[PDB]
């Protein structure tokens, strides 16, 4: 019969099955290697990256959430336990407003303080008291402005030299500074920077104040008055200078100095005589004495507009095309059962 | 005669192939689970990590790019709308140089300003004007030095006591301080710290200056001149002190006190007589009055060199064994192709 | 520098200095603005960049109260 040439065919078929099993075995070894790699090495790398990201987030969030405490600590470390003003981190605006509302003054003073909170901050300060555990303890010292809206006036002078027979006699007032009136007396501040002007209100420093009689006003009408001993200094040698004024300047010109009124671009506008002359800020721009040129007002220069660089996101999410893989796996799942049914009928035939 | 054996061998063979197919389907389920895990649970984590890294980078880059704006805001918040000087973030060096070049003054003044940039900055300041949207608006106020390179001298004094039958007569000069020569007069600064010394140049404060006659220099030749009322104060009781000079010291020793110059490692160098003696900073190192020891010069102490800790990279890239997996996959493909070809050979032989 | 002993008056004079005297004020004005920042909408909950932006806006609002103009 023809059964002679079927044993070899069966042997070849089962050897092919064995070699396909070996191929599937080495495929399973490759799958083992890939699964172990993705389960140990990549997972551990992701865990380490997550830990480092969490550490970075905690550091940044610590800074962000403790900003106020860190800023107070930085300022006290910088100035060694004291702060020159009341910064926005020592005391917030709501805290400052509540404190001003709680002050023992009247409604007008309280309202003016809420209007000039910047000046109350710059006239206050902070004091570091101690450290307990992880805490800093400090005191803010806010000023109380109980006197408001009284007349104040500022006095500036220049030498007044009169020449006779070639011999000079110069008179200069020593009353220069701020005078603001109060109850029972007037407060005098000899230095021009003892009082700080903001808008139309002038904030004066009490440590530098000197109490004088209200009769000091007579010096601005007749210096030779006998009601008040106006303080003037006499001289004999001429002095030339320009005494700047809030809305102008006083210029003094004597003996051998060449002084004139001029501008910045076109130059001279007028030559000044000898003696005192009062120049308004709107009259000209500069004052020249010999070779010295004094400005009357601030020289307004350039205007700059700088914007920082943009900040952009770099989020690039990942995506995997699983449709082809799913189709291939469905084909595998169908084909394996098809082969299983075919071998089922194969072994069912033998009966 | 062995057809039953052939039937049994075929049955065992198809049982083996069915078991192999069941193993293949189990492996297919395993790889399906692996693919779904990798595609969902790991990609979600990597996307979250990417988003967190992007957030961290955006915060850091914001801090880096808006550094000048943030520094200006910090300084104005610390000092409450004022800045004590022109910091390097209020105005860069190129802007400062351009502004100096644009001032209405002469070439010598401009050159000296570009040489003394630091004093320009420290004598200027900046003020906050307002906030509009996400912007800060401020003014920077620069000083204009129009007078340069004129003689300046500083005067220091000590009590000068004389004895007559035990009755003292002490004289002290009150002309102490800075002097600088100007046009039309001399400017006098009663306090030493009114003018700041840098090299051979003295930068004086306008607010503290007092214009005085040019004839004030005759006090340095003969105090008793009738051409000028030199400012001296008389006394009756002795005063012992040491007045520190720029290049030495003045020491007065009177009545029941013991003064002497010496060093810091060895005691007495010399005992000083009674009265004023002038000692240069090269003659000795210290002055001792009774038990009080005054230094003549700065005591130069230790010198430190501190370097910060190093910063290192922690980048460890990951890599896959691609070659072994590719070899295994090629072996799988070649083995399955060989099995298919040889089973085709068997099928062709079965005829 | 050259320093002399004025023995007649128990004083000294130190000459050799050169003056630098201020005569005017020169002013510039600056406008600093924050660069553009985008959403990062992938985050669940508050984001670090949004927190930084809110802190910046709060600091600007507080700084507005100490400006020269009310």
């Amino acid at each position: 019969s023809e059964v002679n040439a079927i044993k070899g065919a069966l042997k070849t078929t089962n050897e092919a099955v064995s070699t396909l099993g070996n191929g599937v075995r080495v495929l399973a070894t490759a799958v083992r290697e890939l699964k172990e790699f993705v389960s140990k090495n990549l997972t551990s790398a992701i865990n380490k990256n997550k830990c480092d990201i969490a550490d970075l987030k905690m550091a940044v969030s610590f800074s962000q959430f403790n900003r106020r405490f860190l800023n107070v600590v930085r300022q006290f470390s910088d100035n060694a336990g004291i702060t020159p003003a009341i910064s926005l981190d020592l005391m917030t605006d709501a805290e400052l407003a509540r404190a001003v509302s709680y002050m023992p003054t009247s409604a007008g003073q309280i309202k003016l303080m809420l209007e000039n909170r910047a000046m109350v901050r710059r006239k206050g300060f902070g004091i570091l008291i101690g450290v307990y555990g992880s805490s800093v303890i400090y005191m803010v010292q806010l000023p109380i402005f109980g006197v408001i809206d009284t007349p104040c006036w500022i006095i500036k002078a220049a030498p007044s030299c009169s020449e006779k027979d070639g011999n000079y006699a110069c008179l200069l007032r020593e009353d220069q500074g701020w005078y603001c009136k109060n109850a029972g007396s007037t407060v005098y501040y000899p230095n021009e920077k003892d009082c700080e002007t903001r808008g139309d209100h002038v904030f004066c420093d009490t440590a530098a104040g000197i109490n004088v009689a209200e009769q000091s006003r007579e010096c601005n009408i007749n210096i030779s008055t006998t009601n008040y001993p106006c303080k003037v200094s006499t001289g004999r040698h001429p002095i030339s200078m320009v005494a700047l004024s809030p809305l102008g300047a006083l210029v003094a010109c004597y003996k051998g100095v060449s002084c004139s009124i001029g501008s910045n671009r076109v130059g001279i506008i007028k030559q000044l005589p000898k003696g005192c002359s009062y120049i308004t800020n709107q009259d000209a721009d500069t004052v020249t004495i010999d070779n010295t040129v004094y400005q009357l007002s601030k020289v307004e220069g350039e205007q700059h507009v700088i914007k920082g660089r943009p900040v952009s996101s770099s989020f690039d999410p990942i995506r995997f095309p699983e449709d082809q893989f799913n189709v291939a796996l469905d084909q595998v799942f169908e084909s394996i059962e098809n082969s299983q049914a075919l071998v089922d009928q194969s072994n069912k035939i033998l009966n | 005669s062995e057809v039953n054996a052939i039937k049994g061998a075929l049955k065992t063979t198809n049982e083996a192939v069915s078991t192999l197919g069941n193993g293949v389907r189990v492996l297919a389920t395993a790889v399906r689970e692996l693919k779904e895990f990798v595609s969902k649970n790991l990609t979600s984590a990597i996307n979250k990590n990417k988003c967190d890294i992007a957030d961290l980078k955006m915060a850091v880059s914001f801090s880096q790019f808006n550094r000048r704006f943030l520094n200006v805001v910090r300084q104005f918040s610390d000092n409450a709308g004022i800045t004590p000087a022109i910091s390097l973030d209020l105005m860069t060096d190129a802007e400062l140089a351009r502004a100096v070049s644009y001032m209405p003054t002469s070439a010598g003044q401009i050159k000296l300003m570009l040489e003394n940039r630091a004093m320009v900055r420290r004598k200027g300041f900046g003020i906050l004007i307002g906030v509009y949207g996400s912007s800060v608006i401020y003014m920077v106020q620069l000083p204009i030095f129009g007078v340069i390179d004129t003689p300046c001298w500083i005067i220091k004094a000590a009590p000068s006591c004389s004895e007559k039958d035990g009755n003292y007569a002490c004289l002290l000069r009150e002309d102490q301080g800075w002097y600088c020569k100007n046009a039309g007069s001399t400017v006098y600064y009663p306090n030493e710290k009114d003018c700041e010394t840098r090299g051979d140049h003295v930068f004086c404060d306008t607010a503290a200056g007092i214009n005085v006659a040019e004839q004030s220099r005759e006090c340095n030749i003969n105090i008793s001149t009738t051409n000028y009322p030199c400012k001296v104060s008389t006394g009756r009781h002795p005063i012992s002190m040491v007045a520190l000079s720029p290049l030495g010291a003045l020491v007065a020793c009177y009545k029941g006190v013991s003064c002497s110059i010496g060093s810091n490692r060895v005691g007495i160098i010399k005992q000083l007589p009674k009265g004023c003696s002038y000692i240069t900073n090269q003659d000795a190192d210290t002055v001792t009055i009774d038990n009080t020891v005054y230094q003549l010069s700065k005591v130069e102490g230790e010198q430190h060199v501190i370097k910060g800790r190093p910063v290192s990279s922690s980048f460890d890239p990951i890599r896959f064994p691609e070659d072994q997996f590719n070899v295994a996959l090629d072996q799988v493909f070649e083995s399955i192709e060989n099995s298919q070809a040889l089973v085709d050979q068997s099928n062709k032989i079965l005829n | 520098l050259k320093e002399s002993y004025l023995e007649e008056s128990c004083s000294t004079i130190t000459e050799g200095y050169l003056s630098v005297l201020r005569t005017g004020w020169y002013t510039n004005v600056f406008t600093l603005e924050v660069g553009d920042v985008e959403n990062l909408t992938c985050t669940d909950g508050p984001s670090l960049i949004k927190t930084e932006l809110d802190l910046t806006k709060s600091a600007l609002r507080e700084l507005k109260t100490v400006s020269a103009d009310q």
Partner: antibody, heavy 124, light 100 residues
Framework: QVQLQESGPGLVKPSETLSLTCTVSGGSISSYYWSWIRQPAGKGLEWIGR???????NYNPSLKSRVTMSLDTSKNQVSLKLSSVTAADTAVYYC??????????????????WGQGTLVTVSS | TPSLSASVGDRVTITCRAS??????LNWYQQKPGKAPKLLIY???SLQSGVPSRFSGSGSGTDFTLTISSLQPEDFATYYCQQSYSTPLFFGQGTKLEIK
């Protein structure tokens, strides 16, 4: 960019005080300088004055005794007030920005941009 | 105001002269009827952004010149020169361009 608009009464009686307002949008009035220019019917342009961020002013010497300028940071407005107006004060009034910046020749200033303007008529 | 008549595509040269030398402190403006003046040239040589390149500035000191190379129907307007050397700012009398 910065845009400007002007608004006013339009009709002013003699010997009264003119009041005009320029409203700035797109920027802040403290970041630059501002000026007023008026142009009578059939005539040329006349510069009136300029105001700085510090609040300082410079006025035309032919109108310095009757012109007041001011800044209001709350509403972002520039104000002009001309007192004792007569028939000779009838014109179209413009507000403009003064730009001061570096040029290849130095520090130069111009007027840009301008407002559309508004007519002011003085009559009895 | 002094007038000038020219055709399309013709070269027009507008000249105005200062009382004294003012270096490069001069500007050019172009005003159309019913509108507001628009800056054309600043610092006597710089072309304002947005202006067509056919307009050119030249001169320094006392003599300045505005030149248009290829005239267009939109170019017909009134042009003024203003000096930025010193205050008060002064504007030129104006040269009204008219069509031929």
């Amino acid at each position: 960019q910065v845009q400007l608009q002007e608004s006013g009464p339009g009709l002013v009686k003699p010997s009264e005080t003119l009041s005009l307002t320029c409203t700035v949008s797109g920027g802040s009035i403290s970041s630059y300088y501002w000026s007023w220019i008026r142009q009578p019917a059939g005539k040329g342009l006349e510069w009136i004055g300029r105001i700085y961020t510090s609040g300082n002013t410079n006025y035309n010497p032919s109108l310095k005794s009757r012109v007041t300028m001011s800044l209001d940071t709350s509403k972002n407005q520039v104000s002009l007030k001309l007192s004792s107006v007569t028939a000779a004060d009838t014109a179209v009034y413009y507000c403009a920005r003064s730009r001061v910046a570096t040029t290849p020749v130095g520090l130069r200033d111009w007027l840009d941009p301008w407002g559309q303007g508004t007519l002011v008529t003085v009559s009895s | 105001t002094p007038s000038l008549s020219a055709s399309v595509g013709d070269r027009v040269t507008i000249t105005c002269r200062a009382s004294q030398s003012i270096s490069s402190y001069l500007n050019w403006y172009q005003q159309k009827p019913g509108k507001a003046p628009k800056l054309l040239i600043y610092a006597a040589s710089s072309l304002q952004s947005g202006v067509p390149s056919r307009f050119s500035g030249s001169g320094s000191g006392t003599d300045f010149t505005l030149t248009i190379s290829s005239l267009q129907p939109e170019d017909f307007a009134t042009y003024y020169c203003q000096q930025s050397y010193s205050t008060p700012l002064f504007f030129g009398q104006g040269t009204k361009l008219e069509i031929k």
